[PDB]
Structure formats: structure tokens, C-alpha cells
Design a protein around this ligand. Structure first.
Ligand SMILES: [K+]
Ligand SMILES: [K+]
Ligand SMILES: [K+]
Ligand SMILES: [K+]
Ligand SMILES: [K+]
Ligand SMILES: [Mg+2]
Ligand SMILES: [Mg+2]
Ligand SMILES: [Mg+2]
Ligand SMILES: [Mg+2]
Ligand code: NA
Ligand code: NA
Ligand code: NA
Ligand code: NA
Ligand code: NA
Lengths: 100, 142, 53, 183, 70, 149, 70, 4, 133
RNA sequence: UUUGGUUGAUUCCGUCAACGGACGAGAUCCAAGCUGCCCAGUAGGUGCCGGGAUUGUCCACACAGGACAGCAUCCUUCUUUAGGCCCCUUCUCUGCGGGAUUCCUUGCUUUUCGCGCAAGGUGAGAUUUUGGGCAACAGCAGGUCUGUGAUGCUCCUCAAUGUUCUGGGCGACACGCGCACUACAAUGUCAGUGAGAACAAGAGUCGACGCUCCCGCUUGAUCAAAAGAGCGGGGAAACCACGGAAUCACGUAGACCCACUUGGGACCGAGUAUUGCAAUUAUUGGUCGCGCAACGAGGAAUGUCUCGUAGGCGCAGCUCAUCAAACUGUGCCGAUUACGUCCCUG
């Protein structure tokens, strides 16, 4: 659990792209990498009446929003790890680096 | 000196039962810690007991059965246990034994009940707006 | 002293306002949104909410 | 080894028969241990005839708004009914239940078509038989000291004997008599 | 009902016309061939297309078909 | 002979025996011994405010403490919040939908105090209570007692 | 309904005189033959079974069924 | 409130 | 299973209220106004009377022991929160009111509110509901 | 763009003064039920090695005590909120994929053919697979000027229909109507013991150097509930959490026994604590009384529903400083009847 990098976004394709090419950036140094972990996907739901004036049949409207989370474990020296993590980041994807 | 072990599973509604069958000096069946023949609902005891009573106790001679159930109420958990037990002996007999011995118990199992080896695919239906349940609608007044 | 008084206290329904139109009727407070339902439906796509089912 | 299943570990399914040749194909007698099955018996048109006879009696017991879905309670009520039947008759309880279903439904009905008499199919005969037994017992045990497990046993026994002191038999005669004069 | 629509029917005739060889009376072999030479997005359509193609081949093995024109 | 033992299977453990029978025997042992202290609050209070009437069993306090011993035995490190969950019911609210209520945590504090005074239970640091060596011995000795009986 | 609440001599003797001859014994039935409460009937039947004049057939928390010993 |  | 003693009596007279000869003792005392269930259980417990006696053998000494317990509940370690009138807005006393004295206090409260001419008093006078309904 | 068969289908086949085309249906999209790769110090298991507890030649077998497993086998079982190590990925997590196609038999099908139906088989699943979401062209003087810094004409505009403050009202009862909740009891009410779900949610982007939100463990306690207080955790697959929900079960040798009764809880009296700047027209929660309020299954009339469905039972979210008999979702027990027709309404 030496180095924890967590990525999360709103686009499954973008999240997968970042993880896959982060691994090749890791695979070019010979770090010890624990495989990516897919955390459970979370959906935020909001239900709202469609009408703006309260008339007619009571018809509703359900909106959703999905969030994908991935986890990667790296065991390497700090000045090295910053070099791996210096890659370009796709728009909409955030990356958090933590050490426990 | 040697270890014989198999792991199977069964599901009824959302309960998942995981059964481990191993060779032991004497047969024992424990469900969530408390042994069989001590489950309070006698009706549910009979349903679990029938997994061995159909093929006879001679095939469960020196086997140890350990089952753990999680989720989905009371009756649905009993049905998942009996399916994980039935799949367990069949899986155990598949190896460590000839092929003729297997498929001699399967026919007895599938003759009595299909669900003893095949999971029931039924699940709860989602609720829709404008309805009190999946099907029933709001009352009309005129 | 007496010009606002109650409004300066800042409590209850009459102290929230909509983030977009400053209205105080039928606000959505989930996830700290503070958008009225009429304005939410118009901006839901840009917020990131899509209708799948 | 394996032995033949016995209902409630006390009653045997062997040496069972139906004296009415019409209903022989619609009353099931496969051996089972308990009246709990939990199978999809309503997917096809005629698949409901394969439910064991004792289970069908169990299903009819849990009817009113209270009792909708209390299968385990119904099994307990059915279980206590059998020994009262066995004590009263000194004969296999399942045999008595088989006889009562055989003789508990009218074989000729009248329908609005001015009403004209028609016939009744085997399946409707079995279904209406069990329905009238549970309905007769349920209304007898309401606001009464008699309790239900020993209200249902008496009416099943009376129906098997064919006595008119039963809800099932009394209604069967009235339907048949009306259908005759209505044609 | 299980009627096959015009989109399914027309594509099946085209496949049989161009690739009558390599086709046989087995659904599973035909499905693999259809998946190779089709670019349809839906998997459901490709299953139906291979189903109707096998039906045509079975009729062809017995007699001529108006629309096939080999 | 229902007490004849099968090959092997020597002794018994609490998890094996019938649950109600063990509680009834354990409650009598507490009563017949007499070292357990019963507070003067054990004649007026109800088990929980969700209940409607006071307990009808004269030995209800002795029964409850035995059950509390069993729960701590099964789940070490449980606290008053957990024990209230184990003893719950549905409250009749009049012309309103019923609601579930938890047991009062005041009584469970008294029950744990009586057991601790009887050196049958000790509290883990920074957590709930667990059972001591004497408490484990007491429960198992009674369980084997029932099996032989 | 004027069911008695406490056992009285005439009913007291009738409990061991006539009841043990009955083929089926139930608290609901006994409360009818002797005009006593259902709660009283259950206690009297338990009294007879301990004596040994009747035998319990089916036992449960809510329902009990007894028959003659021989 | 009152209804009657 | 004890035989009826032939001294079994119906409508046992107690606290100017006829109390049924049948019924268990806690549910027979419930018919005396002001007692109610959950109080008759405490009354029987503090008077040394079994709750499974069914008023069949209620000897005059036991009735007198019961009647003196309810007369002064606090003398037998009944808690103050377990009582009818906790602080008596007029007198300033803690007591339990039973057996045709609760109604007298009820009409005393109604007239007290009327003289005050409070909102609760006038609504009581007109016959309307005094709560929020 | 009709007629003849068929289909939920203007879905197909055939015929044809029409031929070629566009929408809608179908497909596509989401969620379930079966499986493949990749996965772990936030999900889980398997051996051993420690440590802790109980342990029988017979004999005894509940106060009345019964029916249902283990015994040719290598050695009795449980726990580790006194725990060290070794092996793993069936169960959980999910981003792309496979898998169902009337596929295979039998019988029916306009004189053949064609389009297809019914029963069975393979199967996790066998007929739009099951639920949703989307949904054309024409309209209605349907609703909304009480959503907006959407808006035209037209009203008020400084002792105002602008704006703010104080106090009331929106809730007032002889009554009538729609929709819910609770019951009218024994298939029950009350009191104990047992096993046991999923969807979810939780704090600053103005105010006190620290916090605000959601919870756990103790103490309060030499004596009710309701609460003050200490000690901590969680930014949420790590905390609450081994998520001890309610129906449910119990050979509990429990209490009641057919009565407006321990059924039902309306109405009313008295004492307390909390939220709030403020509780009277009772905010709310808890305690003891009142139960002599109807109500014993409901006339004419009338609503919804075809498989994990109806009905029954609870939980979360939302509204929310405090209040859910409402709505939006979630799981738990779990049936009877039909597989039809055009009689009524369309
Ligand atoms: K409505
Ligand atoms: K039109
Ligand atoms: K209003
Ligand atoms: K509302
Ligand atoms: K019609
Ligand atoms: Mg035209
Ligand atoms: Mg208009
Ligand atoms: Mg009540
Ligand atoms: Mg009453
Ligand atoms: Na009854
Ligand atoms: Na109730
Ligand atoms: Na309810
Ligand atoms: Na049709
Ligand atoms: Na305007």
C-alpha cells in the first residue's frame, strides 16, 4: 500500500484509457504494481414531476449520473513515482495520489 | 496426509449459500454454525433434510459439510442451502470417483425436483411511478 | 435595526433562494444542489444528469 | 439406502387409489415429505394439475386479507388436521382427503346463455371441490370456540361420507337440483 | 409472434446470393460466417439473419426459390 | 436411548444445544444460587417504551440476564447499542402505521452490571463487553449438562 | 354462553368419569361437553395426561390433541 | 381539524 | 385445579364499584375508575396477592389490604411519576384519584378554565374540540 | 395505403395502375436472470503452527417428554476483538465480451407453395426473454403570465398593488363529496426466546482559536422513559457494519375463551424533556389516568389486477431547525382463477 493512486470520472472510456496507459508508464520502469481494482459503480438519482404547473396526469422523470472509480497500488520511491504520474490526464478525469 | 475438498454455491432470491464438502472421520452437517437437526422450523428442516434423504445417507458416509448463508429472509435461505448441498455431493463425486457413480445420483435428483440443481431465476419486479406496486394502479374517482 | 431583522436571522424556507433564478418555491436540496425543479429540468444535461430509464 | 418419502414422516402414499375414474388423471399422488414446494405451477394452462393433492388443500387455506401468504401457518394447520381425521376414521388421512375431493363438486351446472344446463369438466370439478371445503370451514370457525384445525377435519370427513351435513355436499345438491329444473 | 421484418429478410437474401458456398444447414457455422461479413451494430439482428439464411438453404436443397437467383 | 452418544463426538458446546432450553436452565441456576443482584427498578419498568405492558414472567430479570450472556458469548465486543437491536418489537401507535422500536438501553446497562459483579463478563478496552474464561466455562458446562439430560 | 370459570364437583368427577371414553379429546370440545372455559379445559386435560388416563397425540404451543389411552 |  | 369453595361471589363490591366475580384480579380491578391496567399489576404486586387468583377467593382482609394500598400509593414505594395528579395546579400536591373522584376533579378543571375565560375554557363550553383538531 | 391468410404491429407472403421513397412499429438505450478475461492491505476463503473452553466401561433418558441424519472408517467438536505464518479466487466488486436463433422433432395450416401457428426437446432462460425509457403526422382557444434578469398591450407607482417590520389568517363548523390510515378479533390479543434484507444517506462553497453533518463505546445509575456529558470514527466498498427490520418461528408443557371482552383506540385530565428568536389555536417525543365513542364484516353503486404477480409486512430517501396516515424507491412472505370472448364499456 506504499503509494495509492485513485482515479474517478464521469466517462468509462476515459477512465479506462488513463488506467491502461498509466500501467505502461509503470511497465516501462519495472515498478511493483498491484493490479487495478474496480470499485463499485455509484449512480445518483433524482425524480421530478415533468409539468411546470401541476396539471394533468402525474408523470415523473428519473435522471441518473454514474461515477466510476479505480484503484492502483504502486511500491516505488517517491522521486520515481512522480515521474510515472507526470503523464497527461484526459479531460474530466481526476487523479488523487495518497500515501498511508 | 491428503486433503479432499470441493466448494459449491446456490441462490434462491438474493440469498447465496456457500457449501464446503471435505473428507472427515465422521459425517457432520452444520448450517451457519448451528448443526442440522437443530433448526427450529421443522418444515424447513425437512426441506434441507431431503437433499440427503433422496439418495440415502450411505453416500454421505464420511463427508463434512459446512454451509454459510447470507441475505434474503428465512424461507429463501433454506432453499439455497439445500441446493448448495445437492450440488456439493455431485461435485465431490465428480472427482475422487468414477463417472458411472456420478449421473446415477443426478437422475434421482432431477427426478424429484429440478430446482435441487438448477437455480430459480425469479426476482422482484421494480416499482413504477403512478403505481402502488409493480402492477396495481391508483384508484379512479369519476 | 428594523429594516431586515427577520431576514438577517437566516432560518426557514424564506432564506434559501434558487441558485439560478432566486426563487424560493420547490427547491432541490439533495447533494447540495439548491436549484428549483423547473430550472433543474432545463439545465440537467449540463449538470451531468442523463435519463436512461 | 433410499426409502419412499412419507408425508410428515408418519403417513405413507402407498396403496392409494381414486374410485372416480373421471378424476383419476387430475389428482396427483406423488410422494412428498412436506406440503411446501415453491414451484412455478401457473406458467402453462394445465400445469396446475401436477401439484400434489395435499399441497392444493394447503394453498386454499390461506385466503382472507389476514392470512394472505402465510404458507408456514397453513402447513401447521393442515398437519394438525390429519390426526383428527385419522382418529375419527381409523383410515389413512390422505385416502379420506382423496375421497372427499372426488364427491364434493357438482357434475352438472347451469349458465346464462334464460339459463341452460351444461356439463362440468374434470379440472373444474377438483378445483371447486377444494374451494368449497376451505370456504365452509373458514366460515364455521369465525366467532366460534371450535378453532379451525378441528373445524376443517369434521367437514372433510362429512363430505367423504357424503352426508348432507356439510357445506360442500349441501351446495352441490342445490346446484344440481336447480340445473335440472332449469332445463 | 415471430415474424422477421423486411430488414432481416433482405439482408439474408443478399448474404445467400454472394456467399452461397461456405454455407450449410448448421445454424452455428452460418452464424460465424455472417458475423464475419457483416458490420451491423445489433447482435440481435445478426442472430436472426443467420436464422433466416439457414431456412433459405434448407428450401434451396429441395427446390428453387424465386428470390435467390443463383 | 436418546442420550446414547454416537461414535466420537465427545462433549458439547453452547452453539450445539437447543437455545431455549439452555436459557431456561441458566436462569434457574442464577435464581437458585442467589448472588445475582436485582435492582428495585425490576418491578415497575417495561422492557422498552415500544412495549405496552410490564413482563408477565416473575423470573423475567433472571431470564433476560442469561440471554444477554448468550449474546455476548456469540458476538464478543458488543455494546448497549447492539443489544438494544437484538431485543426489538413493533409499537402500536393507534390509528397510525406501526413502527419498530429498540429496547431501552438503561435496562441493558443494569443487566451488564449484574453479570460483571458475577465476574462472568469483562469489558474490552475502547469497545463493548466480552466474556471471560469463567463465563465461557459456565456456558459450556450447562450445555453439556443438557445433552446428558 | 354461561361457561363456568372454576372447576366444581359435578364437572370435577365428570372429568375422569366420561371424558377418557371419548375417541377424540380437544380443549374446544371438552369446553362444550362440560360448560367450562377453554382455559380451564386445557388445564384439566393436562391433569389427565399426567395421571395416565389419556394419551397426547399431537402437541404444539397453540393446539393439542388427546385420545383415549386404551 | 374537525370533520363531521 | 382447586374446587370451587361455594363462597365464590359475583360482583365483588369494592371502592363503590361492582367488580366481576370472574376475570383475573388485575383485570377485575381495571373496572374501578382511575386504576386501569399497568396499575392493577403494581397494586397486586405490592399487596402480596397472586395475579392468578381470579377473584374467586378474595377474603375481606385481602380486599382491605388492596383498598389501603390504592388509598396511599406512595406509602408502598410507588414512584411519583407513576401517578394521576403529579402536582395539582390548585392544591400543589401529589396524589392518585380514583373511584368517582376523578370526574369531580374533571368538572373542577372545566369551571376553573371558564372563570379564567381562557381559550380552552370557551371551547369546552361550546362543545368543540380543545386540541388542534 | 384495397381485398385473401398471418402478426401486438400498414409485421410479412401473395395479388395488383402503380413505381420508387421518407417517418412511426422493429432495431438502438438502461436494469435484471446464466457465463469469459482482468482483480484485492476498502471483498472473501483453505492447511498447519500457538493460545482458550467442554469431554462418557456400565449407570442414569425432564415433573408427562416424542418423531426425524452422522456411528468398513486415520485422529471429537467451537472461538481467537495470545496471533504468527503458508497457499488461493467458487462466493463479492466490473470495463469490455459470449449466450436466444422458432434452433431441433411432431402435428396443423388459402388446391398446392409461401408467411407462420400449437405441443414437446435442448437449455440459466423458449417466445417482442422479463421490466422500463424513447415514440410520428394532425389537433384542444386543455394547464401555466404563482419558476426565471421569458414576454406584448394595460393598471399601481412616495401619505404605493413597490419594500420592510409587528400581530392575525390560510387550520374557522350545521353540513355534503373524493382519496388514505385504523378496526370490527381465536387463521386472535398480550409477555418472552430464535434466525434473519436490500435500495440508500452523512460536515463549508456565512458565522464561532475549533467547529456546524451522520454515527459508535462508556458514564449518567446506591435506581423509569425521555437526556445532559465525556471519549472516538467516517469525505464514505475501510465508520455506523458480522447493516441482529417487520411479517415469521418456538414440545414457551406462558396468560385470556366468544364477550363490545385483555378486541378498537376516538375523546379528554395532570407532570416532564427537546427543536426553535418565538410552541396559546395543544410543533414534537415520552409517563400515569379516561376506554359507559362508534364499530359484530357494511344497500344501490363501484376501483385495480394474470407470476416472485394480487394481498400482507416493514425500511430508506424526499419535504425537513422540529413534525409522514403522502409520494419516490427497496427488499421480505407469497397464493386462487383464466390461457377465453365480443354480452356490457370503448
Ligand atoms: K387520485
Ligand atoms: K390522427
Ligand atoms: K390549504
Ligand atoms: K404532498
Ligand atoms: K364489444
Ligand atoms: Mg387514401
Ligand atoms: Mg381556456
Ligand atoms: Mg388493545
Ligand atoms: Mg374494552
Ligand atoms: Na375460532
Ligand atoms: Na393491531
Ligand atoms: Na398496519
Ligand atoms: Na391475431
Ligand atoms: Na404579462
Amino acid at each position: 500500500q506504499r503509494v495509492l493512486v485513485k482515479m474517478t470520472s464521469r466517462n468509462a472510456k476515459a477512465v479506462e484509457r488513463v488506467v491502461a496507459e498509466l500501467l505502461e508508464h509503470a511497465r516501462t520502469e519495472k515498478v511493483e504494481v498491484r493490479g487495478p481494482v474496480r470499485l463499485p459503480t455509484r449512480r445518483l438519482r433524482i425524480t421530478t414531476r415533468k409539468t411546470p404547473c401541476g396539471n394533468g396526469t402525474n408523470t415523473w422523470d428519473t435522471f441518473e449520473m454514474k461515477i466510476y472509480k479505480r484503484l492502483v497500488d504502486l511500491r516505488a520511491s517517491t522521486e520515481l513515482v512522480k515521474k510515472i504520474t507526470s503523464f497527461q490526464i484526459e479531460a474530466g478525469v481526476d487523479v488523487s495520489i495518497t500515501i498511508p | 496426509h491428503t486433503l479432499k475438498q470441493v466448494q459449491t454455491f446456490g441462490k434462491k432470491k438474493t440469498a447465496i449459500a456457500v457449501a464446503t464438502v471435505t473428507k472427515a472421520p465422521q459425517c457432520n452437517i452444520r448450517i451457519n454454525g448451528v448443526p442440522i437437526s437443530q433448526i427450529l422450523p421443522e418444515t424447513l428442516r425437512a426441506k434441507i433434510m431431503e437433499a440427503v434423504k433422496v439418495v440415502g445417507a450411505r453416500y454421505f458416509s464420511r463427508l463434512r459439510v459446512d454451509v454459510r448463508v447470507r441475505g434474503s429472509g428465512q424461507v429463501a435461505q433454506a432453499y439455497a442451502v439445500r441446493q448448495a448441498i445437492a450440488k456439493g455431493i455431485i461435485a465431490y463425486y465428480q472427482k475422487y470417483h468414477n463417472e458411472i457413480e456420478k449421473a446415477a445420483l443426478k437422475d434421482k435428483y432431477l427426478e424429484y425436483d429440478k430446482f435441487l440443481l438448477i437455480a430459480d431465476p425469479r426476482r422482484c419486479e421494480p416499482k413504477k411511478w403512478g403505481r402502488h406496486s409493480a402492477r396495481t394502479r391508483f384508484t379512479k374517482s369519476y | 435595526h428594523q429594516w431586515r431583522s427577520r431576514q438577517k436571522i437566516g432560518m426557514g424556507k424564506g432564506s434559501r433562494h434558487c441558485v439560478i433564478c432566486s426563487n424560493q418555491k420547490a427547491l432541490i436540496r439533495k447533494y447540495e444542489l439548491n436549484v428549483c425543479r423547473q430550472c433543474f429540468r432545463e439545465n440537467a444535461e449540463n449538470i451531468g444528469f442523463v435519463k436512461l430509464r | 439406502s433410499a426409502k419412499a418419502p412419507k408425508l410428515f414422516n408418519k403417513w405413507s402414499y402407498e396403496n392409494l387409489q381414486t374410485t372416480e375414474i373421471a378424476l383419476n388423471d387430475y389428482i396427483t399422488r406423488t410422494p412428498t415429505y412436506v406440503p411446501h414446494s415453491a414451484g412455478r405451477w401457473q406458467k402453462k394452462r394445465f400445469r396446475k394439475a401436477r401439484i400434489p393433492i395435499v399441497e392444493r388443500l394447503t394453498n386454499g387455506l390461506m385466503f382472507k386479507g389476514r392470512g394472505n401468504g402465510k404458507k408456514l401457518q397453513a402447513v401447521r394447520l393442515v398437519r394438525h388436521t390429519l390426526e383428527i381425521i385419522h382418529l375419527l376414521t381409523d383410515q389413512n388421512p390422505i385416502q379420506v382427503v382423496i375421497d372427499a375431493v372426488s364427491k364434493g363438486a357438482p357434475r352438472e351446472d347451469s349458465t346464462r346463455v334464460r339459463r341452460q344446463a351444461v356439463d362440468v369438466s374434470p379440472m373444474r370439478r377438483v378445483n371447486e371441490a377444494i374451494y368449497l371445503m376451505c370456504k365452509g370451514a373458514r366460515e364455521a370457525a369465525f366467532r366460534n370456540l371450535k378453532t379451525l384445525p378441528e373445524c376443517l377435519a369434521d367437514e372433510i370427513v362429512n363430505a367423504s361420507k357424503g352426508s348432507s351435513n356439510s357445506y360442500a355436499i349441501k351446495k352441490k345438491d342445490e346446484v344440481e337440483r336447480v340445473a335440472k329444473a332449469n332445463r | 409472434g415471430k415474424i422477421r421484418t423486411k430488414t432481416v429478410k433482405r439482408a439474408s437474401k443478399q448474404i445467400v446470393e454472394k456467399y452461397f458456398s461456405k454455407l450449410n444447414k448448421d445454424f452455428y457455422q452460418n452464424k460465424r460466417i455472417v458475423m464475419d461479413v457483416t458490420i451491423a451494430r445489433s447482435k440481435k439482428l445478426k442472430n436472426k439473419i443467420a436464422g433466416y439464411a439457414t431456412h433459405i438453404m434448407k428450401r434451396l436443397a429441395r427446390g428453387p426459390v424465386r428470390g435467390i437467383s443463383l | 436411548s436418546k442420550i446414547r452418544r454416537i461414535g466420537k463426538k465427545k462433549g458439547a458446546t453452547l452453539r450445539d444445544v437447543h437455545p431455549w432450553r439452555w436459557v431456561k436452565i441458566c436462569s434457574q441456576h442464577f435464581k437458585q444460587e442467589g448472588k445475582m443482584m436485582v435492582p428495585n427498578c425490576a418491578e415497575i419498568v417495561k422492557t422498552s417504551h415500544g412495549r405496552e405492558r410490564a413482563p408477565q414472567n416473575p423470573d423475567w430479570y433472571y431470564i433476560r440476564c442469561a440471554a444477554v450472556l448468550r449474546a455476548v458469548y456469540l458476538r464478543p465486543g458488543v455494546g448497549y447499542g447492539g443489544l438494544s437491536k437484538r431485543f426489538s418489537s413493533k409499537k402500536n401507535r393507534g390509528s397510525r402505521p406501526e413502527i419498530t422500536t429498540r429496547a431501552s438501553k438503561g435496562l441493558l446497562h443494569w443487566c451488564c452490571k449484574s453479570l460483571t459483579k458475577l465476574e462472568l463478563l469483562e469489558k474490552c478496552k475502547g469497545a463493548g463487553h466480552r466474556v471471560t474464561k469463567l463465563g465461557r466455562k459456565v456456558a459450556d458446562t450447562i450445555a453439556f449438562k443438557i445433552a446428558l439430560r | 354462553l354461561q361457561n363456568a370459570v372454576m372447576f366444581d364437583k359435578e364437572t370435577m368427577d365428570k372429568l375422569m368419569k366420561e371424558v377418557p371414553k371419548y375417541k377424540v379429546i380437544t380443549p374446544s370440545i371438552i369446553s362444550d361437553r362440560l360448560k367450562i372455559s377453554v382455559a380451564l379445559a386445557g388445564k384439566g386435560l393436562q391433569h389427565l395426561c399426567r395421571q395416565g388416563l389419556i394419551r397426547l397425540v399431537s402437541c404444539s404451543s397453540k393446539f393439542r390433541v388427546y385420545t383415549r389411552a386404551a | 381539524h374537525t370533520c363531521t | 385445579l382447586t374446587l370451587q369453595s361455594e363462597s365464590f361471589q359475583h360482583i365483588v363490591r369494592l371502592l363503590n364499584t361492582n367488580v366481576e366475580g370472574k376475570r383475573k384480579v388485575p383485570f377485575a380491578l381495571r373496572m374501578v375508575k382511575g386504576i386501569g391496567i399497568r396499575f392493577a399489576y403494581m397494586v397486586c404486586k405490592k399487596a402480596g396477592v397472586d395475579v392468578e387468583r381470579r377473584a374467586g377467593t378474595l377474603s375481606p382482609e385481602e380486599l382491605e389490604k388492596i383498598s389501603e394500598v390504592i388509598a396511599d400509593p406512595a406509602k408502598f414505594k410507588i414512584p411519583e411519576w407513576f401517578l394521576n395528579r403529579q402536582r395539582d395546579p390548585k392544591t400543589g400536591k401529589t396524589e392518585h384519584l380514583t373511584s368517582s373522584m376523578v370526574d369531580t376533579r374533571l368538572r373542577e378543571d372545566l369551571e376553573r378554565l371558564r372563570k379564567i375565560r381562557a381559550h380552552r375554557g370557551v371551547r369546552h363550553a361550546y362543545g368543540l374540540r380543545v386540541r388542534g383538531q
